[PDB]
Structures are given as C-alpha cells and as structure tokens.
C-alpha cells in the first residue's frame, strides 16, 4: 500500500495549519491527547488546508498510511514579565486568559473597598471631633485649625 | 533501609529520588517508565458473522399432494403451494395439468469463513496494569518488567522494589466491548437470544466452534410464478455487513489521555494518568561511608540564564570549597524545577554547573550537592517558539515565588493600603477614647 | 513556498538561473530493488490553475 505525502505544517499560537495534497482519497484524523479529547475523522479527496488545535497537553494527527505524529504546544505568550505592573497582567493574560481577568477584578475591587472604608473612617472621625465645638460660638484653636482642615479656614 | 516515594505515571519523565541516610552520603536513584499496559478481564458473550442462506432444490410432486415436515434448524421456513405446472428445457413435466404441489424450504446458517472474519462481544471489568521501568543508580543501569499492584517485588543490584497500586481507578473501556480484528468499540450490544434483523447480532453464536446458532433475519417465502422452478424468497440483508459499513468511530481514535488501544490481548498502552507509589529496601552496600566521600562547605548558587521552555532551559552555577576531588549526588528539593543530572564531579577549583527545567516565571528551590544546601532564585523569560515535537520535561507548576516581581508588587500595594487603613482606625479610636476620657 | 504559486521562479523565460523550493526528500530503497524512492509536494502552478 502507498504512503501519503508529508503535509506542510505551519505553527501558530496553540494551532497548526496543515496543507494536504492527496493522489487519491486518503483518510485524515486527529485527536487532542488530554483528559477530554477533540476527535475528528475525514476522507480527504482534493488538495485542502486544515487548522487543528494544539493545547499544552498535546495533539496527534494520522494522515494516510503514515505513522501518527504528536505535537506539543509551549508556554509562549506576548506580555513582558518582570516589568511594569501593566505588562505582568498582559503576560499572565496571554497564557491562562480566563483566571487572570477574574483575579485582577477581585483584587481591584478589594482595594477599592479598603480605600473607601479608610476615607469613610476619616470623614466620620472628623465629623465626630468637630460637632461638639460647632454647637457653641468658640475659637478654632489656631493650633487645631492649622493641623486639621475644617470648614472655616480663617473665619473664627 | 526502608524508603518510599511517589512518582508520576508518565512515560519518559526523568524521575529522581533522593535517599538521605543520616550516617552515609545521600544517593539519588533515577527511575523512568519505559511503557505501561492496562489490560481488562473479558467474558466472551458471543460471536457474530455474516450468514448464509441454504435453499435446497424444491420437491415437486406430479399428480398428487405433499405435506410439509418441520425441522429443527435456525430460522427455518417451509411451505407448500398447490396448482403448480412447472416446465423444463425439453417440455412441461408433471403431466397432470393442475393437480400438482411444490414444497418450498429454506433456512439460514453460519457462513463458510466465520472462523476468519467475525466480531466478538465482551464484558470488560477489573483492569490490571503492568509496566516496564528502567532503574539506575551508582553504576547499575537495567530495566525490569513489573506488576503495578503492591504484590510484586523485583531486585535490582540487591535493592528490593515494590511498585504500589495506581492512584486512580480510571479505565477507558466501558462495561460492554465489541472487538473486530484490531479495533475496539464501546458498544451496548443486544443480549444473547434477542437479536434483531438487519442490525448487529441478527445471528448469534456462543463460540467460534460451537454448534448452536440463534438466527433472526426475517426470512419469508413466496409462490413461484407459473411455469417455472425457482423457489422465491425475501430476506433482510446481513446485520454484520451493515454494522461494518456504519459502526461509527472507534476507541483507537478517540480514547482520552492519548493511550494506544491494541488487541490480542485487548490493552491500552501508555495511558498517562495517576501516580505510582514506590517502596524500596536497600542493602548496606548501596550507600557509601561519610569518610571516603568529599566534604564541601560554604555553598551558594546563582542562575546564569532561565527560560521556562519544555526542554532543560535553565543553567545554574554553584560554588563551594572542597578538600579533595570526588563525586557528589545533587538533587532539587522542589518539583517547581527538575534537575537533569544526579551526580556531579566536584574538584578543587570550586565550580559546578547544572541544567534544570522549569515552567514558572519565578522559581525558588533549594539545591543540595552531597551534604550542603543552598537556595536558588531566578527570573525566567518565556520561549519564543510556539510548538515543539516532544513532551514537557517539568512538572507544570506555574505559581510564582512569593519574592518574585509580580507578587512582591502585590505585597507592596497591599501593605501600603493596610497601613493607610490602620492609621485611619488609630485616628478614630484615639478620637473616641479622647471623647470617653472626658 | 512549496505547493503554492511561485514554488519555482525564474527571472525571464531564457534565464539560466532558477529558484526551486518543492520539498523534495529522498527515501531508503526497499530490500532487493533498484528504484530511488522520493517524495515531493506537487506543483504549485497546477494548483494555482
Ligand atoms: C542505560 O541503558 C540504555 C540501553 O542500553 C542506554 O540507552 C542507549 O544509549 C546509547 C548511547 O546513546 C544509544 O545508542 C545510540 O542510539 C542512537 C539513536 O539514534 C544511534 O543513532 C547511535 O548510533 C547509537 O546506537 C542506544 O540507542 C540507547 N538505547 C536505548 C534503548 O535507549 C542508556 O544510555 C544507559 N544509561 C546509562 C546512564 O548508561
């Protein structure tokens, strides 16, 4: 029996593009060799071009009467680590682009809650400390007036 | 000397185990899985193949009547037809013009080549895996073939190994299996004695060389057309052939974890899942006394380059000082980084260089040669290439070190915010207690 | 590139130089024969046509 020709392989980001040139109807199949595979079989009759996923777990394809060929992806990305904080997030979004956004949103929300609570506590403390002196026409205690920025800058 | 480890069930992974006896120099064993083989237990249910219809030549009774006789044959059919007036090449026989009768008979059988081309229906349960492991240490290579259940012990160089039961109980086969030639299908076949015409199992035989046969093929007979001898009949086509043309997929092309399904005996090869516990018992000749080993002090390590690729993409330089030239046993004490070699020649010069493989942005792991220890920290860059033809040589641990750039930024920002909040709370409490003290 | 338009290129019709990139690869002959096996991606001009 004959041996099919080696297809042309073009490497992408978690993908492979195969150019397939048959002399006669030849069977092409592939699978992703992780926990939940991605099956596919087909009878290729004309010169075609296929795109197949290659996750970090790996992949293999069987083309014609040839032996099956296994290919593994590599932890490559486009952000730049060890740089500014806005590039680390790009780096960790290029690979694992589903938990990075969730973690960043959670952290940002937590920081916002903390800063709002702190500012609220300062506001409440200043109101508490200024409400007694504000029921009598009294002096602002320029030593107190300078240290704490209250409503009257220099008026009493 | 008893020792126990846990090593991954992946073929080609360089596992290295560190055995560190208090009175002796540590040694490192290299264990590798050359292949696995997970094989189930099978109970043959029956055998299916193409059928063959047997149609005997008819019995025409001239000037009379005939009566049908029953027989004990699979899917047997017999009938009689009255008023026949058959013909031959030379003339019409059965001289009585209209007082004649034909006996039509037909039944079904197993085909002539059923012992060469047939499908087997099985129930599969209780898988048991073998394995083949290559073990090397000291100056012994050498590969052994073992049963992965804690009930088989092998001796390599006087060391006694038991490879304990697999971590998982996962099998790719379902309860019911159909095997054809070199192909295995997860199928739910009909039981014996309840097959249907036109589908898989229309004829069922208990064994290749059995004598019984159960057939259900919807055979019928019809009247011969006037003036000729042919025994007409109609029947549903074979269910085995329509199964062959439309069985659908397989398990060879579909199984998870990338494990090769083979048959005779049915097995699933190199099917990477789980962990293998290992228990070992070493003689005293394996170890070396602490006197003839080199003694090394003042150990520090620095990384020259790091790039978290699948290969061994990190290089590490390690400096010390030694009294005499010798040989030590290195080991990396975390699975974040995997070293390449297990022994290193130490010389008076005071430098050794080691190659390791990692998969995280910033690893931090402690490395030891002989008795010393040191902490190695690194800043690692992604690879430029997208796709490689070989498997990962690391343990796929991705969480960065707590002292890495990113998570140190996290600490700085969180600490600043926490200090601000603490100051706010302190101001509030001071104000409240001032109000109370009055 | 092999298999596509322009896998072989020439400056003019009568030019003595030629660029070819067709993925021509030799193979091991089978036992007891004299035949020179090889494999090669089909022409890109025919595919373009
Ligand atoms: C433990 O034993 C195994 C098997 O005896 C050793 O592996 C063997 O290593 C040799 C030397 O590299 C290999 O020979 C070479 O193989 C290449 C492959 O293309 C070939 O081109 C060369 O002409 C040469 O034949 C040999 O194939 C290889 N065998 C296996 C089964 O892998 C291993 O090195 C030993 N370990 C130690 C630490 O000594």
Numbering used by the authors:
A (entry chain I): 267 to 422
B (entry chain F): 1 to 438
C (entry chain G): 196 to 244
Sentences from the paper on this structure:
To elucidate the precise mechanism of SFV-VLDLR recognition, the single LA repeats (LA2-Fc, LA3-Fc, or LA5-Fc) in complex with the native SFV virion and SFV virion alone were firstly reconstructed by cryo-EM. To increase the resolution, a block-based reconstruction algorithm was applied, which improved the resolutions of SFV virion, SFV-LA3-Fc, and SFV-LA5-Fc to 3.02 Å, 3.45 Å, and 3.55 Å, respectively. We assembled the asymmetric units into a completely symmetrical virus particle. The asymmetric unit of the naked virus contains four copies of E1, E2, E3, and capsid protein. All the backbones as well as many side chains of the E1, E2, E3, capsid protein, LA3, and LA5 were clearly defined in the cryo-EM maps. A comparison between the receptor-bound and exposed twofold axis regions of the virus was made through superimposition, revealing no significant conformational changes. Thus, receptor engagement neither induces conformational changes in the virion nor alters the binding patterns of LA repeats.
The Very Low-Density Lipoprotein Receptor (VLDLR) is an entry receptor for the prototypic alphavirus Semliki Forest Virus (SFV). The mature alphavirus virion is approximately 70 nanometers in diameter and has T = 4 icosahedral symmetry. Trimers of E1-E2 heterodimers are organized into 80 trimeric spikes on the virion surface. The LBD is comprised of eight cysteine-rich complement-type repeats, also known as LA domains (LA1 to LA8), which contribute to binding with SFV.
